[PDB]
Amino acid sequence: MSREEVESLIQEVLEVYPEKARKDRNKHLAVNDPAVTQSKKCIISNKKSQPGLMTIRGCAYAGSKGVVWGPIKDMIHISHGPVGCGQYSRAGRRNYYIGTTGVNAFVTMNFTSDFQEKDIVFGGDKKLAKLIDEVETLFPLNKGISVQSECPIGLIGDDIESVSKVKGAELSKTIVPVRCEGFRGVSQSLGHHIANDAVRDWVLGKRDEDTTFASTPYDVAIIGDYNIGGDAWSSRILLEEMGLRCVAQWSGDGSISEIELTPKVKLNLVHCYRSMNYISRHMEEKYGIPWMEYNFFGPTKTIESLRAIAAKFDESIQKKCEEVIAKYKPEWEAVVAKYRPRLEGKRVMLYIGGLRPRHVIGAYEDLGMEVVGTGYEFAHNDDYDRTMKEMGDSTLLYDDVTGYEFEEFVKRIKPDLIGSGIKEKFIFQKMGIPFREMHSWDYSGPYHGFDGFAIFARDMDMTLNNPCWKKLQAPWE
Amino acid sequence: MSREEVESLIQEVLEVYPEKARKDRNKHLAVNDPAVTQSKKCIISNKKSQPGLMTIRGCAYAGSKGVVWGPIKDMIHISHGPVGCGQYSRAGRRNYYIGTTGVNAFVTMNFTSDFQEKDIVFGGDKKLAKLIDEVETLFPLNKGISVQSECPIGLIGDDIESVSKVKGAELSKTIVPVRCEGFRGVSQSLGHHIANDAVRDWVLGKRDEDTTFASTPYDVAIIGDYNIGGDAWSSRILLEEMGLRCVAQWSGDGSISEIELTPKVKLNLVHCYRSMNYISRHMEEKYGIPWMEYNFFGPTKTIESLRAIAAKFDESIQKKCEEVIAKYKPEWEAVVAKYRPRLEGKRVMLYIGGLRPRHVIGAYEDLGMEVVGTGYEFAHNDDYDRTMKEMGDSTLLYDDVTGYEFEEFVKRIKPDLIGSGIKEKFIFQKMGIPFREMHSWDYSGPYHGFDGFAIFARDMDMTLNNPCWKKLQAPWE
Amino acid sequence: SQQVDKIKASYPLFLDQDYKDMLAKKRDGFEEKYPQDKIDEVFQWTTTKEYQELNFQREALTVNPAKACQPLGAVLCALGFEKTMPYVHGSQGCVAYFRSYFNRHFREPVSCVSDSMTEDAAVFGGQQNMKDGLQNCKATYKPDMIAVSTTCMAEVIGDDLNAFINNSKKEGFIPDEFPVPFAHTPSFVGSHVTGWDNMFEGIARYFTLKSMDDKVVGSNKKINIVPGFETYLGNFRVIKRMLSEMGVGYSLLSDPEEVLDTPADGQFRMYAGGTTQEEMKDAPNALNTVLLQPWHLEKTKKFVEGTWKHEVPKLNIPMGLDWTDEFLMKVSEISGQPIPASLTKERGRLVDMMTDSHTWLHGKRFALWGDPDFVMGLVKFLLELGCEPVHILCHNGNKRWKKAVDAILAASPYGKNATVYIGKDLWHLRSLVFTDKPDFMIGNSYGKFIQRDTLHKGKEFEVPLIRIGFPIFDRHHLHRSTTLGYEGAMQILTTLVNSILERLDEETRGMQATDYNHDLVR
Amino acid sequence: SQQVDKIKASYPLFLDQDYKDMLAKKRDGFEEKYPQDKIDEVFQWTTTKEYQELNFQREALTVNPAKACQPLGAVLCALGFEKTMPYVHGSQGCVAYFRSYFNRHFREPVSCVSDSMTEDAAVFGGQQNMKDGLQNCKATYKPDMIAVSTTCMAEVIGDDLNAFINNSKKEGFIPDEFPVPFAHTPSFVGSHVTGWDNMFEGIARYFTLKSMDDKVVGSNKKINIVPGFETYLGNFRVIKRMLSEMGVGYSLLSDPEEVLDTPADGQFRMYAGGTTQEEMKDAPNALNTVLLQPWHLEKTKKFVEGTWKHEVPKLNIPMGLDWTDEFLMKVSEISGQPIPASLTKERGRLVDMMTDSHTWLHGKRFALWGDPDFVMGLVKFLLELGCEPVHILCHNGNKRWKKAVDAILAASPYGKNATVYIGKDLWHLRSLVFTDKPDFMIGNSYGKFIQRDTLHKGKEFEVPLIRIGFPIFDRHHLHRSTTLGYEGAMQILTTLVNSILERLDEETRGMQATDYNHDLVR
Ligand code: ICS
Ligand code: CLF
Ligand code: CLF
Ligand SMILES: [Fe+3]
Ligand SMILES: [Fe+3]
């Protein structure tokens, strides 16, 4: 509580910055008021970062290749350009899949054009065509190729669209050019938009005239779940236990055939609104498929989402939903009874990219834990509209927070546990506050659904109550 | 070389000792003269060691439990007494076997009575009976037990023979008491004798009245091969390629049933004369079974032994011997052609126990290498009678050599290679002369037979010509 | 389903029957997967030599490279100076990736800033971004000095760092006296080590080019040491320790070990240790400059010889036995200090370990990859141990380095069956270790996938990976290890011999089948 | 048959078809082996809980013990003194076994002599053997001092070492001034650590009992350090280094690190380093005496407090964070020297490593065995890491030590499921790890066979071994490792976390089956 002291903290943190940076960053920090549903009057987001302030944001290439296109297992993704971008992003995101890597699955592999000075000076369209030929020769079981753009291609004027068209006509193969150069936009969000547009333009409509697929009234498609440590899998089983048939999965453990079959489903269950809202809306306009957002973080949100989803179908689906809820009730009740006493009353500050800073609040509250501060790297204002009603009164909200701001806020608020990325983990561990990686789940999980809830509680308990946190001060100091 | 120089070296090394020790140790060093047949006139062996001169010799328990009884896989050997003796000798000897350890094989296991002060004061016969009962309960598939005596049992008034008799009658089991206390004798040789006598008295005659075993004119028994690194196995295959049936091997990979079947064979092929001559002679007197010594070290000795063994049987056996020799000729010819050029002219000094100091000379000569000094820890005068003719003129002979004597002799002679045990390996490696462990084959092998000859050459080449030996002197000193 | 007392993570909870049935249904219904026999036949084909010829005929496609881009090395070089902020002129995604990469390798905070150039800068350049970023960085994080590198965006656009920084100083955004060294680090030229070289050369230029009038060689009686791109903190520590026991005054340039190994005692230190500006300014007064990794510090060598007038010795990386000896004697000759008894004893102990482990070390076959200097040092050390290198790969190598490596290989009979590959990636190496199977690989974490592939062919075809190099992501605290000098040679020897022994123990653990050779003593 | 280009040792050359046929024929013809189904059923029975009750009902039979006899520890203690010859009064087979044991552990020469008592001495005693042995040893190997221990033969016969040595000096066999300390070390009492304690107590008595008149406590301003039975040279080194950075004058008693780590430079040194006679004579003048391993130096503590009048602190083994801190503060209090910044930084780095690895360390189950002090230190450190001890075994432990360990376990929730076993051997531990499976074992080389047995039950039942303790026979140069202090804690933590990670990597290496969790980053 104590909104006024939070505003005083905000101003005190702001005092260090220069005039222009001061006034820019003042708009991106806010004190939450749950009654406010219009976050534009309270917080500004989706703007360019201030130079030299150590932001956490990524680039559009990370949004497109790293997030959306990369998880597709049966397609080969060429990081077209210099060698760094593919190397730093190779296998850094735990998008789980089932396949034989190097034969019919290529997710953890780094394909790149390895640009040199001659390619910068004289262009790389011919090199792109030669690379496509070599990929066809060396990986015959591939079912499609994507060409993900890095900065030099956008700067030097290479026409990858024409190369993709000619080579796709030549080899009768799907070649998707993505203009995902890193200087476009201000974060990974424009990467999401560009990848969605590429999916729409080059992949989605390939089976519009095809009617051989047998459809059922219970066909659904999971959109925006990227199977982080198997998360999507732990969701699908629940949906399969409710009696629904999951045809497609965007894009965790995903295949191009599933994306092609997506326009045949009856309902689109969207988990990450921020990354997949474009394609969900496009599918609604073109095929008439309704979509709905759902949350599988924690037993309460999972039950609410399951009942809301079952409400879209007939009575048998609702009965199956009640059966599933009854079956899984004792497990999460036992998890709560075991772990809530060790977690009750602790305070959490969160800072993640665009969906989780508000999605995981319910799971934390299910264990008797309070979120006092939250923020986003690249969310839009509608995300903050959704965030305000789920956060407590007079809690701190931050957009595109700087490292200095984050450290000062943590030092003042003194939370019991911080959830953020790898670029804050060791900073906050050295100050003696427990930290959980909330992008990759600290190489653990999954966290979605009932099975993931137990892992979530176990991980939170193991990190928050670890004895190591009592030892930072030497006995003679 | 230069006999008088070697005698001068012997006297110079002798000068350090006190008068009594000087006088005793002068008899144990000699200059070889191949014309000499009686070695008693030049060298004295099988005497007590001088106190505190750092001898390499072991004890009678090492000779009995460690060497002879231990390799028997299906019998459980109880190191009766304090805990040290079984612990230091557990799995220290690479006597290889095939079995499921802990169920029907127990070679690498250490069974002990774990003597405490109360056992010293009040005796341990009741403890022995209780231990036997516990062994029966916990290891039901065992096919016999031996009780190996350590020093206190000889010192205190314990009667293990009566306990063995009563327990063996009660459980209908073979229990062999071995009075192998370490203070008996002067080395492992008396251990060999005592173990042979125990085998004769308690195990050998159990199937004298049994005639169910079907015998053939080509039945043979391998005696004195302990399957070091699989050596015995590499011998047996040759004998079975020759057309002979190997009923038993003492005691490498040995079983009590094989020992019981031994009195049914037509010929005893003895490899280690020193340890098994007693039982070979006993079998000759009691059953009429002839025995012969043979050498499988190096292709020359192997071929000579194969032909000599062939001469004991009919014409088909000799034809098969010639077939085996012809089959294996190209392999060892290729081994020689590859390795002799890198080993020709090198000088070797050897010091081992009872048999190998003269057995491995032929294999060294097959690679063009010269043995300049050799000696024994515990061999008897007949072994030196064989060694004198096996060794070259004016070569050094040493019996029960001390550490100081060995170091001085090596420092003067300066051999290219030394063959000895683990207690000299690091001493001689620090001085910069390559060393090969000739008891355990440096955890390599096997060396017996044609297959083992290749490993022998490869190992000698790898150690003699290793680059590490050129780096002992720092470039600035 | 989950049991509250024994909760299962992704492995093995996805091995439950319900999840297996779900995955089978998904694959059979919607993935349109190729038949398993087709997949097996394609895999077997990729294990063959014909696939190797097709793989080595590649000219445009790179698969799983073994290098990075220049600004990463530039950031690593910049972090080695006291209270210095690495500043990358360009797009922010590169800085995010660099920070994540170094965080995962070192498990430590890694500080770096960007000026966040966008399409507007793609049209008009990033001068305003530079001014605002320098002002904001100095005001917020208070560094003593800002070192500026570039992303490929700024390099392709053509931004002039010198003019931009001069205009920043002229317009009052940052003080004129504030040190702002800069270097162009194009990602399409060379690799990360080239970026390290460029960063160091630019910093040394900034601090010494315009003040050489009063410099006299050998005045301060010290030796400059330049480590290059280095990711083992034990390497800095052992260099300093050996120089200390010898009583040799030294000035180590770009020291990042303090800032990369800060204690966890309740406070966050953004800066720690590092080479001071005074040392950089006084460097031309040293007796000489020793370059630890000469094969990626050629520009630095050219500057040091041309301007500081230092006769830079022709020294290899002090790895293994002989090269450490040569480094020690060269340092002794330059400084006039004799080699003490402690170093001689340490060398003797290393030789003793070599004699102890030679039997297991002899004749073993290794594939290996990494940076040129590290690769040649490890190949030299392996030759000294009697090991046989077979596949030697260096993605960022050149022809002269290959010639020197071939010369090293010709001087030992253990290099007879060795081939050096430059410009090849880890797909090439996967083909090589399928077609000419070694006993082990030596490389960074990316090799683990190669290991997996060999296990898929069979247990008898598996090539275990030995983790030496950069980056190491799947093991903890290996960045503290030592690779240079006698201590590093001891650590490498222990790692190699014990990996061999663990492999042998695993292969002989089957009871009544292979356990006859499961010796207690080895 | 052998191929000249690829020659095979025992493994896998015995896996050839001809050898397999030969072995099958041998077994079927002459071994009279039990049927394989019977063997499998007996093995499965031995993995059960009923077999565990039968195993734990043992009273007379010991199977695979985890200790040695006193004279081994006496020899280790004697080797820690300058130019000192360990001399065992008894039979020569014991000396051969001691030397081979220490040679295999340290891979170094180990010097020791015996007077070679035979059946003749069994009725007359070994007085003549003692005289001749002392004379010959002094004349031949020229030691500065001879330390005499006993085998069980001399103990049972009842030889009086004091009278024998006095008569040797009276009859001119050795000079009266030559120092010949002695101790009775019966093998049927205690274990090797007890022999170390007895050896050290006798030596200190010989050098200080009769000259206490002029001794004043604290005169030399030093602290005595007694390590006890120690087989890690890094432990001696880290103790000396920690005392050195603190600026604390110290006198280490029984230092064997020099003689156990001599260089290989072309000469053999029989003696090297070690505690001098002057230090032993001046020990009563120290401020205090600190005992590193109090649970096997009780006789030494009694002598030190009774005669030297030193208030020996109640200190645990300085293993792990808390006990290293307590040792450092106690040393600071005794010496008056503050703890410097370097030690604080090292402690902070250890805490940082703990925070980095806590996620993988948490909740893991360990069986462990070894000597009492080492076992309790490792249990304390594992509790500090959030690990769960389950099976704690100490063959040479006692009831008071078990009570103290239980007190340590009660003070942490991670010790809830832990049981302490004293007087149990490794067959008991095999039963325990079959019936209550932990994640890993921590112990010496003899544990490998237990690991084998688990693999026989199944891959899912395998418990990997972690090699910490004495003796280590199947790995090279692990005797150079460090266990005490912050550096030892860092090494132990790295070993544990990386063993966990290698196990996880092996479990997830199956392509298309378990490799979904074969992450690049952990
Ligand atoms: S038994 Fe003897 S010492 Fe004949 S006690 Fe010894 S496995 Fe030696 S020279 Mo070790 S009489 Fe065997 C022997 Fe030779 S243990 Fe082995 S190598 S051929
Ligand atoms: S914002 Fe994004 S990550 Fe940055 S470059 Fe642009 S697409 Fe890529 Fe790859 S190569 Fe290196 S890291 Fe850059 S500087 Fe040239
Ligand atoms: S000569 Fe031989 S090895 Fe020596 S004791 Fe005697 S049988 Fe045995 Fe075992 S227990 Fe220890 S080592 Fe001895 S002193 Fe008492
Ligand atoms: Fe860290
Ligand atoms: Fe050694």
Q: How far apart are the C-alpha atoms of C154 and D285, rounded to whole Å?
A: 72
Ligand with minimal distance to B360 CA:
1
Residue C449: both structure tokens together: 């996938």
The residue type at B167: K
Residue A113: both structure tokens together: 């054009």
Catalytic residue list contains B93: yes
Q: Tokens 């990370």 map to which residue? A: A62
Q: Are A267 and A182 in contact (CB under 8 A)?
A: no
- Helix/strand/coil for D364: coil
C-alpha distances out from residue A275 to A80, A196, A198, A251, A380, Å: 22, 8, 13, 11, 11
Q: Are A222 and A293 in contact (CB under 8 A)?
A: no
Instruction: Establish if B163 belongs to a structural domain.
Output: yes
Residues B261 and B188 in one domain: no
Residues A185 and A236 in one domain: no
Residues C331 and C315 in one domain: no
Backbone angles phi, psi at C118, to 5 degrees: -125, -170
Q: How far apart are the C-alpha atoms of C36 and C42, rounded to whole Å?
A: 10
Residues D346 and D490 in one domain: yes
Residues B41 and B129 in one domain: no
B435-437 and C145-150 beta bridge pairing: unpaired
Residues D105 and D160 in one domain: yes
Instruction: Establish if D88 belongs to a structural domain.
Output: yes
Instruction: Establish if D11 belongs to a structural domain.
Output: no
Q: Domain boundary at C182, C214, C246, which?
A: C214
Rounded to a whole number of angstroms, the distance from the CA of C343 to the nearest CA of chain D is 11
Backbone angles phi, psi at D366, to 5 degrees: -130, 135
Q: Are B223 and B268 in contact (CB under 8 A)?
A: yes
Q: Are B353 and B376 in contact (CB under 8 A)?
A: yes
Residues B305 and B351 in one domain: no
Contact C11 D497 (CB under 8 A): no
- Cβ(B58) – ligand 3 distance below 6 Å: no
The residue type at D481: S
Q: Tokens 């296990």 map to which residue? A: C455
Q: How far apart are the C-alpha atoms of C519 and D134, rounded to whole Å?
A: 38
Q: Tokens 């966008």 map to which residue? A: C118
What's the number of CA atoms in the CB half-sphere (13 Å) around residue D521? 26
Catalytic, out of D77, D137, D152, D405: D152
From atom 2 of ligand 2, which residue's Cα is the shortest distance away?
Answer: A182
Q: How far apart are the C-alpha atoms of A411 and D497, rounded to whole Å?
A: 31
C-alpha distances out from residue C163 to A399, C78, C131, Å: 34, 21, 11
Structural domain that includes position B282: 203-317
Chain centroid, CA C445 distance in Å: 12
Q: DSSP readout, C83-109?
A: TEEEEEES-HHHHHHHHHHHHHHHSS-
Residue C204: both structure tokens together: 């040394």
Instruction: Establish if B323 belongs to a structural domain.
Output: no
How far the first Cα of chain B sits from its last, in Å, is 33
CATH of the domain at B373: 3.40.50.1980
Exposure string of B167-187, with b = 16+ CB inside 10 Å and e = fewer, is: bbeeeebbbbbbbbbbbbbbb
Q: How far apart are the C-alpha atoms of D453 and C510, rounded to whole Å?
A: 9
Q: Which residue on chain D is closest to A432 by alpha carbon? A: D355
Residues B195 and B118 in one domain: yes
Rounded to a whole number of angstroms, the distance from the CA of C518 to the nearest CA of chain B is 10
Q: How far apart are the C-alpha atoms of D423 and D425, rounded to whole Å?
A: 7
Measure D200 CA to ligand 3 centroid, in angstroms: 21
Q: Are A362 and A295 in contact (CB under 8 A)?
A: yes
Instruction: Establish if C413 belongs to a structural domain.
Output: yes
- Cis, peptide link before residue D65, omega less than 30° from 0: no
Q: Tokens 């220069």 map to which residue? A: A18
- Helix/strand/coil for A268: strand
User: In DSSP terms, which residues pair with B376 in a beta bridge?
Assistant: B352, B399
Q: How far apart are the C-alpha atoms of C471 and C95, rounded to whole Å?
A: 17
Which bin fits A448, alpha (ψ -120 to 50), beta or left (φ > 0)? beta
Residue D246: both structure tokens together: 């603190």
Q: How far apart are the C-alpha atoms of C305 and B345, rounded to whole Å?
A: 53
CATH of the domain at C522: 1.20.89.10
B324 closest CA partner among D18, D357, C282, D409: D18
C522 closest CA partner among B444, A232, D116: B444
CATH of the domain at D89: 3.40.50.1980
Residues D393 and D246 in one domain: no
Q: Are B244 and B317 in contact (CB under 8 A)?
A: yes
Residues D165 and D267 in one domain: no
Q: Are A306 and A238 in contact (CB under 8 A)?
A: yes
Measure C396 CA to ligand 4 centroid, in angstroms: 29
The beta-carbon neighbor of C521 closest among B92, B426, B472 is B92
Residues B64 and B197 in one domain: yes
Residue C26: both structure tokens together: 């998904």
Q: Which of B45, B235, B355, B448 to mutate to test the pocket of ligand 1 (most atoms within 8 A of CB)?
A: B355
C320 closest CA partner among C244, C248, C383: C383
Residue D155: both structure tokens together: 């103990």
Q: How far apart are the C-alpha atoms of A335 and C29, rounded to whole Å?
A: 34
Instruction: Establish if A182 belongs to a structural domain.
Output: yes
The beta-carbon neighbor of A51 closest among C104, C129, C265 is C129
How far the first Cα of chain A sits from its last, in Å, is 34
Q: How far apart are the C-alpha atoms of D488 and D318, rounded to whole Å?
A: 10
Q: If you compute the radius of gyration of chain A from its CA atoms, what whole number of angstroms results?
A: 23
Q: Tokens 């998360």 map to which residue? A: A231
Residues of chain A found within 8 Å of residue D329, distances taken between Cβ atoms: 475-476
What ranges in C118-182 are assigned the alpha helix state H?
Answer: 119-124, 127-141, 152-157, 161-170
A24 closest CA partner among D467, C116, C306: C116
Backbone angles phi, psi at A175, to 5 degrees: -120, 115
A417-420 and A435-437 beta bridge pairing: parallel
Structural domain that includes position D114: 69-214
Instruction: Establish if C55 belongs to a structural domain.
Output: no
Residues 240-269 of D with CB under 8 A from C: 261-265
Q: Domain boundary at B169, B202, B235, which?
A: B202
Residues D454 and D407 in one domain: yes
Residues 1-60 of D with CB under 8 A from B: 1-2, 4, 7, 9-10, 13-14, 18-19, 22-23, 25-27, 29-34, 38-39, 42-43, 46, 51, 54-55, 58-60
Instruction: Establish if C181 belongs to a structural domain.
Output: yes
Instruction: Write the CB contacts of C247 (distance below 8 Å, at least 6 apart in sequence).
Output: C337, C340
Strands laid side by side in the D113-114 sheet: D113-114, D84-89, D145-150
D306 closest CA partner among D227, D225, D204: D204
Q: Which of D70, D72, D91, D192 to mutate to test the pocket of ligand 3 (most atoms within 8 A of CB)?
A: D91
Residues B65 and B190 in one domain: yes
* Inter-axis angle of helices B3-14 and B19-26, nearest 10: 150
Q: How far apart are the C-alpha atoms of D185 and B84, rounded to whole Å?
A: 12
The residue type at A446: P
- Helix/strand/coil for C196: helix
Instruction: Establish if A337 belongs to a structural domain.
Output: no
Instruction: Establish if C38 belongs to a structural domain.
Output: no
Q: How far apart are the C-alpha atoms of D361 and B121, rounded to whole Å?
A: 49
Residues D489 and D518 in one domain: yes
Residues C82 and C209 in one domain: yes
The residue type at C94: C
Contact D122 B458 (CB under 8 A): no
Residues A222 and A155 in one domain: no
Residues D198 and D295 in one domain: no
Residues D456 and D439 in one domain: yes
Instruction: Establish if C382 belongs to a structural domain.
Output: yes
The beta-carbon neighbor of C188 closest among A82, A338, A421 is A82
Contact B468 C339 (CB under 8 A): no
Measure C259 CA to ligand 4 centroid, in angstroms: 11
Q: How far apart are the C-alpha atoms of C116 and C114, rounded to whole Å?
A: 5
Number of domains in chain C: 4
Residues B298 and B356 in one domain: no
Q: DSSP readout, A212-223?
A: -S---TTEEEEE
Residues found in chain A: 477
Q: Are B249 and D29 in contact (CB under 8 A)?
A: no
DSSP state of C479: G
The beta-carbon neighbor of D351 closest among C107, C264, C498 is C264
Q: Domain boundary at C288, C319, C350, which?
A: C319
Give the number of other CB atoms < 10 A from CB of residue B212: 5
Instruction: Establish if C11 belongs to a structural domain.
Output: no
DSSP state of C222: -
Residue C167: both structure tokens together: 């205009």
Residues of chain C found within 8 Å of residue D520, distances taken between Cβ atoms: 445-446, 448-449, 473-474
Residue C98: both structure tokens together: 């660099």
C100 closest CA partner among A89, A312, D89: A89
Q: How far apart are the C-alpha atoms of D269 and D141, rounded to whole Å?
A: 11
Q: How far apart are the C-alpha atoms of C502 and C497, rounded to whole Å?
A: 9
User: In DSSP terms, which residues pair with D388 in a beta bridge?
Assistant: D365
Residue positions of C in the annotated binding site? Answer: 69, 94, 152, 187
Q: How far apart are the C-alpha atoms of B301 and D109, rounded to whole Å?
A: 35
Residues A174 and A215 in one domain: no
User: For C293-394, where are the E strands, in sequence order?
Assistant: 365-369, 388-394
Measure A252 CA to ligand 3 centroid, in angstroms: 67
Experimental method: cryo-EM
Determine if residue A85 is labeled as part of a ligand binding site.
yes
DSSP state of C27: I
Residue C481: both structure tokens together: 């290890």
Handedness of CA D99, D100, D104, D109 (dihedral sign): positive
Q: How far apart are the C-alpha atoms of B435 and B378, rounded to whole Å?
A: 21
Number of domains in chain B: 3
- Cβ(C74) – ligand 2 distance below 6 Å: no
Residues D456 and D389 in one domain: yes
Residues A55 and A146 in one domain: no
Handedness of CA B63, B68, B71, B77 (dihedral sign): negative
Residues D513 and D410 in one domain: no
A346 closest CA partner among A297, A394, A417: A417
Which bin fits A272, alpha (ψ -120 to 50), beta or left (φ > 0)? beta
Contact D349 C264 (CB under 8 A): yes
> Hey, which chains touch B, using 3+ CB pairs under 8 Å?
C, D
Q: How far apart are the C-alpha atoms of C441 and C369, rounded to whole Å?
A: 8
Q: How far apart are the C-alpha atoms of B66 and B68, rounded to whole Å?
A: 6
What's the number of CA atoms in the CB half-sphere (13 Å) around residue D311? 6
Q: How far apart are the C-alpha atoms of B1 and D275, rounded to whole Å?
A: 45
Q: Tokens 């046929």 map to which residue? A: D21
- The residues of A that are catalytic are 59, 62, 93, 192
Strands laid side by side in the A370-376 sheet: A29-31, A396-399, A370-376, A347-350, A417-420, A435-437
Residues A33 and A23 in one domain: yes
